[PDB]
Structures are given as structure tokens and as C-alpha cells.
A paper describes a structure:
Here we identify PTP1B as an inhibitor of IL-6 and show that, in vitro, it can dephosphorylate all four members of the JAK family. Asp181 acts as both a proton donor, enabling protonation of the tyrosyl leaving group, and as a proton acceptor, receiving a proton from the water molecule that hydrolyzes the phosphoenzyme intermediate.
Although our structural and biochemical data show that PTP1B exhibits a preference for dephosphorylation of the second pTyr of JAK2, it is clear that both pTyr residues can be dephosphorylated. In order to observe the first pTyr in the active site, we solved structures of PTP1B (D181A/Q262A/C215A) bound to a substrate peptide in which only the first or second tyrosine was phosphorylated (ie. pYY or YpY) to 2.34 and 3.09 Å resolution respectively. These structures confirmed that either phosphotyrosine can occupy the catalytic pocket. For both monophosphorylated peptides, the phosphorylated tyrosine occupies the catalytic pocket. Two copies of the PTP1B and peptide are present in the asymmetric unit for the PTP1B pYY structure, with each copy of PTP1B forming different contacts with the JAK2 pYY peptide. In one copy, Arg 47 of PTP1B interacts with the −3 Asp of the peptide, and the carbonyl oxygen of Lys 41 in PTP1B interacts with the −2 Lys of the peptide. In the other copy, Arg 47 interacts with the −2 Glu (1006) in the peptide. The differences in contacts between PTP1B and the peptide between the two structures may be due to crystal contacts, as in the first copy, the crystal contact likely holds the peptide in place.
Residue numbers in the entry:
A (entry chain D): 1161 to 1165
B (entry chain A): 2 to 282
């Protein structure tokens, strides 16, 4: 649910 | 000129530092509307939001929020709408945005399936005879033709407002082999794709801003727009070698957080502008 890592 | 500046950065290996500097200096603006609880399910990622001041507003009394930003480069005289890969519930919004903003082209830089995960909804019809109807926004979308090449596809779409029965041709430029947080196959592959987008007239000011997206719509999208703007400026200016890529990127990040997501993408944008300059002279 997050773009980064 | 820039090639010399490019030679230097590569030798030191400071790309990660040059990039980390741009990140430190990048603008930070409130994202109140994107973070409203009623909009959680309109955002693909919690760490990627449009700034309140540059966000696109849907012309809908219900809820005007879409995860999309207007990027207005006033010196280069070109605007872009950067947005996320539409969600299954936001495909209607995406095409409403395309209609309301009078966009003529859509540039997609991701794939609908990446690493077994769905990075994006199937927001355009795959077969001429299976058109898409969006009930909520009263829009119909038909695949007219497609031209498939080894690393990109160009599709021709018809967008119709069911209320007015106006129809518009939308061009869909789909770079199909650009991986998340990676780079295109080569500068030449990127430049050929960009030049096809340019030649179609979709970046012309006679239309609304082109829509550019990936999965989040910041990394690959920023690489595409940064290179397109820098090349525009080198044609306009009486001193082409003057253009400073980091200044242009920081100007773009006043409108959307996170544009260009890795040091290698930043490096690749320089390469594309240097290599792309030979065609403009």
C-alpha cells in the first residue's frame, strides 16, 4: 500500500 | 557543455548525492484534500499524494478528488497532468478528467501486471468489440485500432460523453517495457517514444494537457516529463547549453512530490537530453 521500498 | 557536466558527475559517482540533494530541497506543500478519510480509497499509495494547490478537480458536485496534479512549466510553455494508475473504482474519474481537461493524449509508462501484482486497472478496452461504459460518469470508451511495436504500443480510442454524445479521439501511448524504479532500454528507445508522442500533436497547446501516468505517476512520469521539458527549453533559448536539469526538476517538483524516483532515473534523464539534443540542432 506504499510505492516506496 | 552538459556532456562535460555529465562526465564529471559520473566520475565522482555523486548521482546518489545529487539526487539526495534534489530530494532535500524539493518543495513540501500540504495535501489536505488527498488525505481526507473519504478519499482513502481514491489513492493507490499512502505515500504519494497530489498537492492541494496543483491538484486536478473533477467537475462533479459529489466529490471532486482525483489523485492527479497539473504541472505547468511556464517558461517551456507546456503543461502535463501526472496521475496514478487508475484504480478499479477510479477509472470513471480518470476518463472524466480526460474529458473535462480536453486532453488529446494519454501516456502510460507502466504495465497493468508487474511482478505478479496489479499496479493498475484495465482502464481501456482490449478488444474493438468490447467497449467500456462507465455508469457513474456517463462515458463510453471504444478501442478503434492499435499498432504494437516491440517496446511500445500506440492505441487509438474514441471517448464519447453519453449525455451530450460528443465524441473525441484519444491517442494512447504505452511504453510497455519500462520497469518500476528502472530505466528504458536505451536513450534511443525513449527518444523514439517521446518523438512519436510529440509528432502526434498531443503536446501541442491547442489541446488540454496530456495525461502521463505510471503506477504512482511520479518516477517514470517524472523521467518522461523532465526530458521533454528540458528539450523544449533548449530549442527556445538562445543558449541551449545553459539548461540546468536539476533546476528544471526542482521547478517540476513544486507541482507534484517525488518526480523521478531513483538516482538512475535522474542519470537517465540527463542521457536522454544529451542524446536528444543532436536531433534538435
Amino acid at each position: 500500500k506504499e510505492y516506496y521500498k | 557543455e552538459m556532456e562535460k557536466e555529465f562526465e564529471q558527475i559520473d566520475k565522482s559517482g555523486s548521482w546518489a548525492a545529487i539526487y539526495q540533494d534534489i530530494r532535500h530541497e524539493a518543495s513540501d506543500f500540504p495535501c489536505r484534500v488527498a488525505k481526507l478519510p473519504k478519499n482513502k480509497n481514491r489513492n493507490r499509495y499512502r505515500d504519494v499524494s497530489p498537492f492541494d494547490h496543483s491538484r486536478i478537480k473533477l467537475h462533479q458536485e459529489d466529490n471532486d478528488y482525483i489523485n492527479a496534479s497539473l504541472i505547468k512549466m511556464e517558461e517551456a510553455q507546456r503543461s502535463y497532468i501526472l496521475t496514478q494508475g487508475p484504480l478499479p473504482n477510479t477509472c470513471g474519474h480518470f476518463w472524466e478528467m480526460v474529458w473535462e481537461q480536453k486532453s488529446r493524449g494519454v501516456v502510460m509508462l507502466n504495465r497493468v501486471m508487474e511482478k505478479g501484482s496489479l499496479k493498475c486497472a484495465q482502464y481501456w478496452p482490449q478488444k474493438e468489440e468490447k467497449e467500456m461504459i462507465f455508469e457513474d460518469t456517463n462515458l463510453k470508451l471504444t478501442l478503434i485500432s492499435e499498432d504494437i511495436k516491440s517496446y511500445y504500443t500506440v492505441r487509438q480510442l474514441e471517448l464519447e460523453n453519453l449525455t451530450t454524445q460528443e465524441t473525441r479521439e484519444i491517442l494512447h501511448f504505452h511504453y510497455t517495457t519500462w520497469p518500476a524504479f528502472g530505466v528504458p532500454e536505451s536513450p534511443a528507445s525513449f527518444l523514439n517514444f517521446l518523438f512519436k508522442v510529440r509528432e502526434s500533436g498531443s503536446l501541442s497547446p491547442e489541446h488540454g494537457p496530456v495525461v502521463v501516468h505510471a503506477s504512482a505517476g511520479i518516477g517514470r512520469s517524472g523521467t518522461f516529463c523532465l526530458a521533454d521539458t528540458c528539450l523544449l527549453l533548449m530549442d527556445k533559448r538562445k543558449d541551449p547549453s545553459s539548461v540546468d536539469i536539476k533546476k528544471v526538476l526542482l521547478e517540476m517538483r513544486k507541482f507534484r512530490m517525488g518526480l523521478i524516483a531513483t538516482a538512475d532515473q535522474l542519470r537517465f534523464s540527463y542521457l536522454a537530453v544529451i542524446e536528444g539534443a543532436k536531433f534538435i540542432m
